[PDB]
Amino acid sequence: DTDVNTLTRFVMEEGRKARGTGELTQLLNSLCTAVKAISSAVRKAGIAHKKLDVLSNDLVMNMLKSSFATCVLVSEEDKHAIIVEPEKRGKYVVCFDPLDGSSNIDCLVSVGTIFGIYRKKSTDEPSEKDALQPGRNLVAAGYALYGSATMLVLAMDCGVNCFMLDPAIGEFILVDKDVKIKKKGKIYSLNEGYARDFDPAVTEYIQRKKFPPDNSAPYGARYVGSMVADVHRTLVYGGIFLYPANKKSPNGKLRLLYECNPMAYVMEKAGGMATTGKEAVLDVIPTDIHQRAPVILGSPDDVLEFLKVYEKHSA
Amino acid sequence: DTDVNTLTRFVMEEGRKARGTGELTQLLNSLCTAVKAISSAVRKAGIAHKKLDVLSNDLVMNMLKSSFATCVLVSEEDKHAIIVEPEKRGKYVVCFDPLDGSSNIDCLVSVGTIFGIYRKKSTDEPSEKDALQPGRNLVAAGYALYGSATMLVLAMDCGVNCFMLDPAIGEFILVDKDVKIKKKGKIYSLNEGYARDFDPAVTEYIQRKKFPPDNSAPYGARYVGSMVADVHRTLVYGGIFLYPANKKSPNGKLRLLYECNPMAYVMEKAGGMATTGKEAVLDVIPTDIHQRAPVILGSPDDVLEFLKVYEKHSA
Amino acid sequence: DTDVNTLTRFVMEEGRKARGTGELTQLLNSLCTAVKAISSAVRKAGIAHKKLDVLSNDLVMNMLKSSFATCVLVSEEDKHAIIVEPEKRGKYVVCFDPLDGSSNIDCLVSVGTIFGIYRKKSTDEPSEKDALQPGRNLVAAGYALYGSATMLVLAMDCGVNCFMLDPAIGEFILVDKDVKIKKKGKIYSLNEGYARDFDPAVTEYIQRKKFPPDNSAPYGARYVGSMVADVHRTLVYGGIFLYPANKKSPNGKLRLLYECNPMAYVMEKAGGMATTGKEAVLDVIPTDIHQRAPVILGSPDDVLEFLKVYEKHSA
Amino acid sequence: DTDVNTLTRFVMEEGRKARGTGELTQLLNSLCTAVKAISSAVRKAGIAHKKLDVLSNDLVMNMLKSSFATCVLVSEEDKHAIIVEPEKRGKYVVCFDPLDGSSNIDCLVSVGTIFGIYRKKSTDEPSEKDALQPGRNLVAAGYALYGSATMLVLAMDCGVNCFMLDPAIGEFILVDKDVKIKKKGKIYSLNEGYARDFDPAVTEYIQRKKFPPDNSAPYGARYVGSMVADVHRTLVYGGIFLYPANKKSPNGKLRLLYECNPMAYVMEKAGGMATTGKEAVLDVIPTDIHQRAPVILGSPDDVLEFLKVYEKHSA
Ligand SMILES: [Mg+2]
Ligand SMILES: [Mg+2]
Ligand SMILES: [Mg+2]
Ligand SMILES: [Mg+2]
């Protein structure tokens, strides 16, 4: 139409509401350019003119440094933090997973991009330490799901806002404003293929869902295998998504900073819940930028059910 | 690329080996066009001003009438068969599902298109009864996956070929030729929430997958909920896919003619297997165009293992 | 919509009207794939990952050989004719200009693709001689204009049909059916920058248009500089387009087979006129496949005016 | 490309050298989005269900209001100025022509978008009078050509930069940096059909172009009829472009503020010239926002030669 409400307009508007400097708007525009390019790359993965995780990491990194908004960056496919050139520093710390779960291009890719944005609190010259914040300090968080439509979900204080990429103009158009997740769902999501390294809490919760004690309808099961896809489904349809310990640690597999914290934040801003079993995910204070966390997230009543089973039939 | 290998070029060149008439190529270009339109519609599902399955059915039906290659069409969202006007009548019979597994305008849509192509054999006037052919007689069959890339998997007598949609030119490009599924996989795919209603064969097989007897690694679980995505993953990665039986589905939920048979055909054509427990899906002779059938398909050793269990009638 | 009338449908329909073998339909599908690829290339000429005339020639050539419809091909950027592999011969001779007027990619390209299709009359093994036909024998002719929209204009016996490329699905959609050009126009098109190697006929006609003897409104002047653009404008708006002798020969500059004949044919099928001054363009029998012809084409009354000035105030 | 040079990145990086506020970047992203939407609309001009100039005006106006960077907007298809609501009010004044030279739904459309960006200088409340600034004070100016590729020519204090639209990602990419027009050209551009009404200066210059005195080669003629295309050709190839005076235009047809001034600014910024015969276009001080002005612009030696003739007041 003639009054197209794009992502950049939306961020500019709640940012004018917030009397801010618009540095975050530059940051999110850079992210959007990276996401559009990654989307069109995944488009045509099997027409090789690969290395897609590396190329996505580089693309995101350069756009963020060129945003004039970031000063410390953290990546899944990079080892320690990267201190943005003083020539182009900003007030923001970004932890991101450029690309998650891919590299069988020739007939299949299932991918998404996760990010979280914290403001820099200290006044020291920046280092790794500035990215070591608890997830409750996030200024913004979100993901881009590369599916049958390229979609950006973005969480801020007003809540969670839906965006779909319009290929005809190459802009993200807002779809849903103030997204809320259902109180209780009908779908659970976890890799049951393990099932033998599980906590008895995980087993008894799954059993409650497969053989309901009220003789009610059993929960449907869904597990795409790429995190962002499962989490997005759990945000749209309602339900619970589970990645517990499973022969890794009492700390799970997904990384806290760039995979668990942004999802926890989107979930919380949509009204859902996100725990590790012991403490809420957003309350974990990290000590390594690459440290893993167990994650049980989703609809509030379903996560409360899991926490009851953890309180009684677990350990 | 000055030597683009398009799907139309592909059918046109494997069809001169068989000394055909050229009607299959016209039919497949018609499906090509219909699928491309559907994929863009899915592109902008929340941007473009619902009812995607009836629009998809009408579009596919129209393009198939205009190919001058069909006489009988059968569609999932249409009750009885449609008999092509004689001015537009070819020799083929198409059993197709335009769209399967979608409908959310807030955000997520996950869907594909399935088709199988018979040749009319009887000298009667064309009618519904000419669709009731065993899957072993399919001339060609396959599916379009509307995922992060739009993909056409086409199976014929010589085998299975993978086609990606280059969105810059609007044609489908050959990616993998003569695809073959692994003999043994490490992924099992089914809706375990229905585990109440499993007859004991499936439960034995699945507990064997999670708790292997020979101390080898367990299988990972994967289940998207859209058949096209799940069968595509089974083909691309190897494994097994199950949708056998519930209390709400004594016969199974999937439809033999336009869902079970095309996937089973692509499967045996990729070196894999596809059973109902009792008989191979391709050897089933249908009696209603909408009749249902249980399906277990995938890598040969996995389907054979499930069949070992099934024939044993174990605990 | 759900009844999209594409180029392939249209050619299939007037081809079923003509009881033909559909070999021409294969030919035009191959042409369309070449045109879509060329269009997307010109799209992004200044994002070099050039040689565009060579690459366009190769693309068109390979698609035509892979159409199973052609046996002799002629190109602007190729020296003699190319005899299609017997493995993939057809009944048709194609003379084409793959690309006309380009190669300043870095900030500007103005281009189109011309083609004419004659049926092979003789029964000799094919050679250059089969492309040496007068333009009145054309079975099909047309052009693709690469502008603010990619457009294919196609002339056959029913007349001239308009087609625009829909990027969202990558198919050409019919726009105008049975195009006719105005009886008399208001625009003339020729490179007045020469003006000193002109025939007195050309000068007095141009003067009649600039200083009208009836004190009527003078003709507007338009000269894009790329032939297909000027000819398309002359087909849409009405007028006259001129390329006479001009220090080259009494035979002009544009090549007869692939630039002058197809335009003459499109013009004639739209109701306009196309002359060399002496004989009608479509009546010239060529003796070299690369021979030049003067060309005055456009609306019938405007070309008749030119021919009156040629009959009286010329030589 | 992992280091994409976008237009937004470009403005954002040449704006930190000047220690600006960032409002120009927001304004130019707004124009970026509006132009991309317009270019797709033009894409499908005959496919998509007229009135492109009012739609273009409304779209550009809306995106400029939403940038929070403008206070006064002036548009060719709008009578008096528009004063931006204070909640959306920036410091800049934009004089723009959304669309110029189009409207055929059968087929051809040939058009561009022009803009020039002033800074409000007076301490009055914003109003129409703040648009009446001499072109020598433009902060930035340029045009979008909607041709065979969509192109944005942006001129600022440092010079002129060329941007192409990559349609796969929906951003504008830097192609040529610091463009410079040739000193002397071989192409003259004007509507010679109006030759009746030429005051003798133009006729002398043009007869000098066709019949050079020093036995050197004559200039080629080029005239598209859309100003943006013609001025783009003049810049890219070198030459001269004329639209001075008719009997239906004692002042000329072109509009100073949104047509003449942006092109003249891009021109002097590319090392070229732009006059009215009497004065440089950039040094003209306007009195009506819709006032007209004659223009002669292009390569410096060609405009200087025309000025030699003009000052001589020759035959
Ligand atoms: Mg990861
Ligand atoms: Mg179905
Ligand atoms: Mg040529
Ligand atoms: Mg205008």
Q: How far is CA C73 from the centre of its chain?
A: 16
Chain C contact for B4, CB < 8 A? Answer: yes
Chain A contact for C108, CB < 8 A? Answer: no
Among residues D60, D101, D104, the alpha carbon closest in space to that of D78 is found at D60
Among residues B29, B118, B33, the alpha carbon closest in space to that of B81 is found at B118
Chain A contact for B182, CB < 8 A? Answer: no
C104, D237 Cβ separation under 8 angstroms: yes
DSSP B70: E
For residue A167, give the chain C residue with the closest CA: C168
Q: Does B116 belong to an annotated binding site? A: no
Q: What part of D 88-107 touches C (C-beta under 8 Å)?
A: 104, 106-107
Neighboring chains of B (3 or more beta-carbon pairs < 8 A): A, C, D
Residues of D in contact with C52 (CB under 8 A): none
DSSP state letters, B236-293: HH--EEEE---SS-TT-SSBIIIIIHHHHHHHHHTT-EEE-SSSBGGG---SSTT-B-
Give, to the nearest 10 degrees, the angle between helix D52-66 and helix A7-17: 30
Chain C contact for B18, CB < 8 A? Answer: no
Alpha carbon of C42: minimum distance to chain D alpha carbons (Å): 7
Chain D contact for A58, CB < 8 A? Answer: yes
Please state, in angstroms and rounded to a whole number, the distance separating the CA atoms of residues B45 and D124.
Answer: 48
Residues of C in contact with B58 (CB under 8 A): 2-3
Distance from residue A113's CA to the centre of ligand 1 (Å): 9
Chain B contact for C65, CB < 8 A? Answer: no
Query: Residues near B296 by Cβ (< 8 Å), separated by ≥ 6?
Result: B240, B241, B242, B244, B274, B275, B276, B277, B303, B306
SS3 B298: strand
Residues of B in contact with A179 (CB under 8 A): 106
Amino acid at site D300: P
The domain ranges of chain A are 1-178, 179-313
Give, to the nearest 10 degrees, the angle between helix D52-66 and helix D23-43: 160
Chain B contact for D168, CB < 8 A? Answer: yes
DSSP state letters, chain A: -TT--BHHHHHHHHHHHTT--SHHHHHHHHHHHHHHHHHHHHHTTTS----HHHHHHHHHHHHHHTTT-EEEEEETTSSS-EE--GGG--SEEEEEES--S--BTTTB--EEEEEEEEE----SPP-GGGG---GGGEEEEEEEEESSSEEEEEEETTEEEEEEEETTTTEEEE--SS----SS-SEEE--TTT-SS--HHHHHHHHHHHS-TTS-PPPEE-B-SSHHHHHHHHHHH--EEEE--TTT-TT-SSBIIIIIHHHHHHHHHTT-EEE-SSSBGGG---SSTT-B--EEEE-HHHHHHHHHHHHHS--
Residues of C in contact with A168 (CB under 8 A): 167-168
Please state, in angstroms and rounded to a whole number, the distance separating the CA atoms of residues D73 and D92.
Answer: 9
Which ligand lies nearest the alpha carbon of C57? 3
**Cross-chain residue pair B4–C171, CB shorter than 8 Å:** no
Q: Both tokens of residue B88?
A: 């537009």
Please state, in angstroms and rounded to a whole number, the distance separating the CA atoms of residues C91 and A193.
Answer: 60
Among residues A197, A192, A222, the alpha carbon closest in space to that of A207 is found at A192
CA distances from D186 to A190, D207, D210 (A): 71, 14, 11
Amino acid at site B21: T
Binding site as annotated, residues of C for Mg(2+)? 76, 97, 99-100, 259
Which ligand lies nearest the alpha carbon of D228? 4
First to last CA, chain D: 59
Q: How many residues does chain D have?
A: 315
Q: Give residue for tokens 């200088």.
A: D121
Nearest to B107 among A162, A196, A220 (CB): A162
Experimental approach taken: X-ray
For D137, other C-beta atoms within 10 Å of its C-beta total: 13
Q: Give residue for tokens 């004594």.
A: B250
Resolution in A: 3.0
DSSP B209: H
Alpha carbon of C96: minimum distance to chain D alpha carbons (Å): 20
DSSP B139: S
A152, A144 Cβ separation under 8 angstroms: yes
| CB burial readout A197-216, b (16+ within 10 A) else e | ebbebbebbbebbbeeeeee
Chain C contact for B250, CB < 8 A? Answer: no
Which ligand lies nearest the alpha carbon of D77? 4
Q: Give residue for tokens 């249908």.
A: B286
Please state, in angstroms and rounded to a whole number, the distance separating the CA atoms of residues C300 and C274.
Answer: 9
| Sheet of strand A187-189, all strands in order from the earlier edge strand to the far edge | A220-221, A187-189, A240-243, A295-298, A273-275
Please state, in angstroms and rounded to a whole number, the distance separating the CA atoms of residues B67 and B33.
Answer: 11
Chain A contact for C48, CB < 8 A? Answer: no
Among residues C165, C128, C154, C150, the alpha carbon closest in space to that of C288 is found at C128
| Sheet of strand C150-156, all strands in order from the earlier edge strand to the far edge | C82-83, C70-75, C92-97, C111-119, C138-146, C150-156, C159-166, C171-174
Which ligand lies nearest the alpha carbon of D56? 4
Q: Give residue for tokens 């079993």.
A: A277
Q: Both tokens of residue A256?
A: 């806290």
HEC string of C237-264? HCCEEEECCCCCCCCCCCEHHHHHHHHH
Amino acid at site A248: K
DSSP state letters, C251-312: T-SSBIIIIIHHHHHHHHHTT-EEE-SSSBGGG---SSTT-B--EEEE-HHHHHHHHHHHHH
For ligand 1, an ion, list residues with CB under 5 A: A 76, 97, 100
Cα angle D188-D308-D213, degrees, rounded to a multiple of 5 = 65
Q: Are strands D140-146 and A138-146 parallel, antiparallel or unpaired?
A: unpaired
CB pairs under 8 A between A and B: 161
A143, A266 Cβ separation under 8 angstroms: yes
**Cross-chain residue pair C8–B22, CB shorter than 8 Å:** no
Chain B contact for C173, CB < 8 A? Answer: no
Please enumerate, as own/partner, the contacts of D83-89 that have beta carbons within 8 Å and a separation of 24 or more. D83/D126, D83/D127, D84/D126, D89/D126
Q: How far is CA C304 from the centre of its chain?
A: 21
Binding site as annotated, residues of A for substrate? 100-103, 191-194, 222-227, 243, 253-255
C42, D149 Cβ separation under 8 angstroms: yes
Q: How far is CA B287 from the centre of its chain?
A: 20
Please state, in angstroms and rounded to a whole number, the distance separating the CA atoms of residues C51 and C63.
Answer: 18
Sign of the Cα pseudo-torsion (B261, B267, B270, B271, in order)? negative
Distance from residue D259's CA to the centre of ligand 4 (Å): 6
First to last CA, chain B: 59
Please state, in angstroms and rounded to a whole number, the distance separating the CA atoms of residues C177 and C269.
Answer: 12
Please state, in angstroms and rounded to a whole number, the distance separating the CA atoms of residues A232 and A237.
Answer: 9
Please state, in angstroms and rounded to a whole number, the distance separating the CA atoms of residues C75 and C57.
Answer: 7
Please state, in angstroms and rounded to a whole number, the distance separating the CA atoms of residues C92 and C121.
Answer: 9
Q: Rounded to the nearest 5°, which phi and psi values hold at C14?
A: -70, -15
Side-chain-side CA neighbours of B88 within 13 Å: the count stands at: 18
SS3 C157: coil
Nearest to B191 among A47, A179, A220 (CB): A220
Q: Give residue for tokens 């099909």.
A: C140
Alpha carbon of A149: minimum distance to chain B alpha carbons (Å): 5
HEC string of C37-55? HHHHHHHCCCCCCCCHHHH
**Cross-chain residue pair D4–A63, CB shorter than 8 Å:** yes
Is residue A50 classed exposed, middle or buried when 0-12, 13-18 and 19+ CB atoms within 10 A define those classes?
middle
Discontinuities after residues in chain D (C–N over 2.5 A): 49
Chain D contact for A313, CB < 8 A? Answer: no
Is residue D79 classed exposed, middle or buried when 0-12, 13-18 and 19+ CB atoms within 10 A define those classes?
exposed
